[PDB]
RNA sequence: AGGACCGAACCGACUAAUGAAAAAUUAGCGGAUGACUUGUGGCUGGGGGUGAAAGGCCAAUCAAACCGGGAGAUAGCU
RNA sequence: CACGGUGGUCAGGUAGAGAAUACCAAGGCGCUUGAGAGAACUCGGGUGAAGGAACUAGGCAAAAUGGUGCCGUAACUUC
RNA sequence: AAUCCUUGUCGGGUAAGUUCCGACUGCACGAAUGGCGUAAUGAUGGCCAGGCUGUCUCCACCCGAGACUCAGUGAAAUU
RNA sequence: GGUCGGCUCAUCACAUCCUGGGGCUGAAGUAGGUCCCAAGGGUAUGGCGUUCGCCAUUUAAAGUGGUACGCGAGCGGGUUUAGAACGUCGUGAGACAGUCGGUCCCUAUCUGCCGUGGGCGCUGGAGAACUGAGGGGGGCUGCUCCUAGUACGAGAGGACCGGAGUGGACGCAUCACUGGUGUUCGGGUUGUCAUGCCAAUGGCACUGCCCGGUAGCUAAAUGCGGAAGAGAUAAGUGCUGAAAGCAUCUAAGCACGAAACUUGCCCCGAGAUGAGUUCUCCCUGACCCUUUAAGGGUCCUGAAGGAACGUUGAAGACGACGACGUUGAUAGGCCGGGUGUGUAAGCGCAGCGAUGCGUUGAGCUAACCGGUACUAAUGAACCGUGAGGCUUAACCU
């Protein structure tokens, strides 16, 4: 099944009548609109390409404009593809709504996590710090040894080291979908989903379920 | 800590590939005074986007 | 990291920074135009403009506050008697940055910061 | 944001009384046990309040059966049935964490008259 | 949030005033015990004539903590000190006949029903 | 009264982490009216001095100083 | 080396037992590279839920104690 | 014991003690190269407790100095 | 001409400790024994220079080895300098794998590894979205309940198979909550100096010492994860079945069969030079010249787009990535709100005064929220061109 392209609004909480507080991520899912419908014949696979949001007509480029124009649709902030299953047809101008998620119970939300920048091994890989005292010289959060002497005589590939942490695609799976609000174009899912406030989020029905 | 073989001159050259400077793309000309200057900076006489912002 | 954080440190401790902003602001008030490094100038907007705003509403308490902020009586007077009634109508934007090339001794980007209704 | 605010406000209680820190408050809370909801009171001194609309909370401290107990109520949760100020206290702080290390006569807090 | 070497007070009337946790049971590498969590304790300070005696190694169940417990609505309940109730090693039911100080709804179960019944206040 | 006590100067150098420094730093540390400390000048000379003794110290040099000489010592070794 | 050592004399104010310490006077200086940025890591500091030596060869290091007056003060003792 | 066998054996202390304290076959104590005691003293060795704590469970954040970027100056071991 | 142990980081083997699959059992059950397959993941904290070991208490389990007895250009208790002493040996200097003190340097050239860019390429150029060759991550497991006190058993005890919940450890994300921090917010307060003085403020004393605390970042906080399924198998079980009239799991054929293998889940990924696909956009001019070919040159021309500059960012070492540049909310300011602090100053009253009360939940309030062009984001200029080779085929006419 296809998914939608929301925006992370923020977190809040839904008190139940029973007493339970449910922590929700508010995902604003304005109307995703189809641009392109790919197939086995021309493109080699079934999929739909969708867009969402608005964009400055002065800041959308010519080629971008043309693509949208062909579709017969407004220029949105991006383009996103969704592979179609057997028996999933979609027309080119068609607009999909959060209404689509009313039947589903769980979702996989996918997005670009917050960027920590250059992170050391303690933050990045949970490396245990070395001793804060007892003689320890200039080597408190340093990663320790990184190999074995002479054989293999090299650091192995994939060695856990400091480096760029976050700002990368992550998928949280099986998040229970609390509320679908078609009126306000909202989707409340339980629990935290990746990335900062205002970030794009791809919501899909959960693959494992 | 230190090299085992003197690195080549070729190697050095390669290293300094990227060391080259970039000349300013193009200077801007003030609409009033007609005198060249960096974009968004005042001119040497003291004009900016036409009007004389600072007296000499 | 520093997501959402405000303020430039400016390779100074806090107290020193505060002092310099007090001085710089005062100088600006006095002269209505000063040349300074660009970042510093930028920083100054968030000290001077608020002072100016404060000076619009002339009260004893307000005056006292201004003094506390700045600590030159002359400066305070200038703010209250001249600058406040000058910028009375203006909503924000009392000051202006004007990038002016690069300092000789250390290639620091300079910039004139000046009060808006100067000339 | 706007949307978040909207979401929140349609969940807030409109009947929360004005209490401050230092007040002796009596918070009635629902308690489920078996198949019978019942109301359990928690009288004590409000040592702290956190104002954050829907995420507003308040911390009530009491001395039950010798042991000192703090309890942090989420103000707009439906588990609290009723808040009710029994006595109003005159203190000069937003938060009375000093009362954690005070007992009996030391932990008295004079009444806020008028 | 009790761990190895943490000294708890004793809620029951078994005899021990002060006990030390020597093991948080129920897992490899398990860091902490909260309320309703069985721990292995040693008795460090006891009354002259109680049921238990100093230096007795035996199980206990934690019934108040200073860190405290969360409820589903997001409320937390804290206490001023960490307290437990001593138990038999085998039967795992309380030695003491009388619980002092309040306990929590967390504790109520077929395991520690006796304790809850005993207790003056359950929060 | 005191090779008495606490403690700055002054004299030292137990722990610590860290070239400006061919032995220092900062934070603590010991003595601080004495077998104390310090200025100026004097005397003791190399198998000699001096040594509350560690082979310590004798001009950044010590199980025998430095300088010059025997001297191009000798080197079955590299 | 425009880099630690170096004997004597002078000794203001407020607080203080004080030539300690803090803030000041007289007087003298800002230490001859600056400007930004606000990653890892290193140095020097601050604070830390719950636990409180479980750390470690070792409580190393930190934390703590810290003043004046008054009450009170054990074994042992060469008194 | 400033004793190989040896973590001797018994007792104390600890949930658990190759260390510590008290006692009982001196590999190889012993009487001025002094024996055995000993109040006081010790930047002396060992062990235990109270307090205290980022020592640690298990790290988090913050403030400064470097590290990074720009301009000026401009080394070194090694080869 | 760096030798133990500890820490930090590991990685491989399988002679497997746990978990998984099976045969035999002197296997009734439960729990065991033993052998076979299996290396996916997992595989303890403490007490007493050690490794080890003993002991305490856990655990599904606390595997055995290799890696310069892995790891000191990653971080000194032991042995192994100089001081001193005991026992012992020696006439003695001294000596003893017999028994308090005692400097662990190195700014990384290359390989390697973790990140991140610049160039050129991919055959006209440009902007997007993809496919996915290949690569990496992930793969642990307890307890409880039901099935069922059923099967089994003389009883005691007590299941397989299959299902449901809730934990531990590990990982990913996140900041709504609970909290930490919060030298950029508010307040208390000691000493002192200043603003002429009072009052009120500011400086300095670790942020002077404290108490609170916004945003961010964050764990102890709270969400999610390990799978099911499929394919091909291991040991093993078989079905039909001769060679060998029988028998035989096999030689022909057919079937089942495990955390291993290939997939399925998540991430990177066309420099995948084998350089892929789809969509869209842009350029449709002159003449010289000759060593006549994918040649060189001069005028005009300059697109799509890009870069640069500026305002900047929950992006960031720098590059990069994203947003915006007046047809504008990109930043600062301003307005309103919120949050925090906790009733400012001034004035009045009460008090001999310290102080209290009123005005007053006041004042002030960072990084937040919602608005607002007041200040700054300039008209340009710069790079990028002018229809894109040859040979075959098929098509169109």
UniProtKB/Swiss-Prot annotation, chain A:
Post-translational modification note: Methylated by PrmB.
Keyword field: Methylation, Ribonucleoprotein, Ribosomal protein, RNA-binding, rRNA-binding
GO molecular function: rRNA binding; structural constituent of ribosome
Residues annotated with N6-succinyllysine modification: 38
Modified residues (N5-methylglutamine): 150
UniProt key word RNA-binding: yes
GO cellular component: cytoplasm; cytosol; cytosolic large ribosomal subunit
Single GO biological process annotation from the record: cytoplasmic translation
InterPro entries: Ribosomal_uL3 (IPR000597), Ribosomal_uL3_bac/org-type (IPR019927), Ribosomal_uL3_CS (IPR019926), Transl_B-barrel_sf (IPR009000)
Pfam family, one: Ribosomal_L3
NCBIfam families per the UniProt record, alphabetical: L3_bact
Family as reported in the entry's similarity comment: Belongs to the universal ribosomal protein uL3 family.
Cross-referenced PANTHER family: 50S RIBOSOMAL PROTEIN L3, LARGE RIBOSOMAL SUBUNIT PROTEIN UL3C
Role: One of two assembly initiator proteins, it binds directly near the 3'-end of the 23S rRNA, where it nucleates assembly of the 50S subunit.
Protein name, as recorded: Large ribosomal subunit protein uL3
Taxonomic lineage: Bacteria, Pseudomonadati, Pseudomonadota, Gammaproteobacteria, Enterobacterales
Underlying gene: rplC
């Amino acid at each position: 099944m296809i998914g939608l392209v929301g925006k992370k609004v923020g977190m809040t909480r839904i008190f139940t009548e029973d007493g339970v507080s449910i922590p929700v991520t508010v995902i604003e899912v304005e109307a995703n609109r189809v641009t392109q419908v790919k197939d086995l014949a021309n493109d080699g696979y079934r999929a739909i390409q969708v867009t969402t949001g608005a964009k400055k007509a002065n800041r959308v480029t010519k080629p971008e404009a043309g693509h949208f124009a062909k579709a017969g649709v407004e220029a949105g902030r991006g383009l996103w593809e969704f592979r179609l299953a057997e028996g999933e047809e979609f027309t080119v101008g068609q607009s999909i709504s959060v209404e689509l998620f009313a039947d589903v119970k769980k979702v996989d939300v996918t997005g670009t996590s917050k960027g920590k920048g250059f992170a050391g091994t303690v933050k990045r890989w949970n490396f245990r710090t070395q001793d804060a005292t007892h003689g320890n010289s200039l080597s408190h959060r340093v990663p320790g040894s990184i190999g074995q002497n002479q054989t293999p005589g090299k650091v192995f590939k994939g060695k856990k080291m400091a480096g760029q942490m976050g700002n990368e695609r992550v998928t949280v799976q099986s998040l229970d979908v609390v509320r679908v609000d078609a009126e306000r174009n909202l989707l409340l899912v339980k629990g935290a989903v990746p990335g900062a406030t205002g970030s794009d989020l791809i919501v899909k029905p959960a693959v494992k379920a | 800590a230190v090299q085992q073989n003197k690195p080549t001159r070729s190697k050095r050259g390669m290293r300094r590939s990227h060391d080259a400077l970039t000349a300013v793309t193009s200077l801007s000309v003030d609409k009033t005074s007609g005198e060249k200057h960096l974009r968004h900076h005042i001119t040497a006489d003291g004009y900016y986007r036409g009007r004389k912002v600072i007296a000499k | 990291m520093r997501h959402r954080k405000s303020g430039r440190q400016l390779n100074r401790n806090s107290s020193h920074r505060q002092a310099m902003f007090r001085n710089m602001a005062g100088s600006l008030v006095r002269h209505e135009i000063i040349k300074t490094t660009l970042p510093k100038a930028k920083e100054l907007r968030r000290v001077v403009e608020p002072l100016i705003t404060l000076a619009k509403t002339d009260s004893v308490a307000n005056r006292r506050l201004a003094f506390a902020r700045t600590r030159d009586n002359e400066i305070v007077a200038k703010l209250f008697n001249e600058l406040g009634p000058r910028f009375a109508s203006r909503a924000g934007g009392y000051t202006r940055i004007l990038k002016c090339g690069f300092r000789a001794g250390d290639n620091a980007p300079m910039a004139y910061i000046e009060l808006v209704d100067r000339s | 944001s706007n949307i978040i605010k909207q979401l929140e406000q349609e969940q807030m209680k409109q009947d929360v009384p004005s209490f401050r820190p230092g007040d002796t408050v009596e918070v009635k809370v629902w308690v489920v046990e078996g198949s019978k909801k019942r109301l359990q009171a928690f009288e004590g001194v409000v040592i702290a309040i956190r104002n954050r609309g829907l995420h507003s909370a308040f911390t009530v401290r009491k001395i039950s059966n010798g042991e000192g107990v703090e309890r942090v109520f989420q103000t707009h949760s439906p588990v609290v049935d009723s808040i009710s100020v029994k006595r109003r206290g005159a203190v000069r702080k937003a938060k009375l964490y000093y009362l954690r290390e005070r007992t009996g006569k030391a932990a008295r807090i004079k009444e806020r008259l008028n | 949030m009790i761990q190895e070497q943490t000294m708890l007070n004793v809620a029951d009337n078994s005899g021990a005033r002060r006990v030390m946790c020597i093991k948080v049971l129920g897992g490899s590498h398990r860091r902490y015990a909260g309320v309703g969590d069985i721990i292995k304790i040693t008795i460090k300070e006891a009354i002259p004539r109680g049921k238990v005696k100093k230096g007795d190694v035996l199980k206990a169940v934690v019934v108040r903590t200073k860190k405290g417990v969360r409820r589903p609505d997001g409320s937390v309940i804290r206490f001023d000190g960490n307290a437990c109730v001593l138990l038999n090693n085998n039967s795992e039911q309380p030695i003491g006949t009388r619980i002092f100080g309040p306990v929590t709804r967390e504790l109520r179960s077929e395991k520690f029903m006796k304790i809850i019944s005993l207790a003056p206040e359950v929060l």
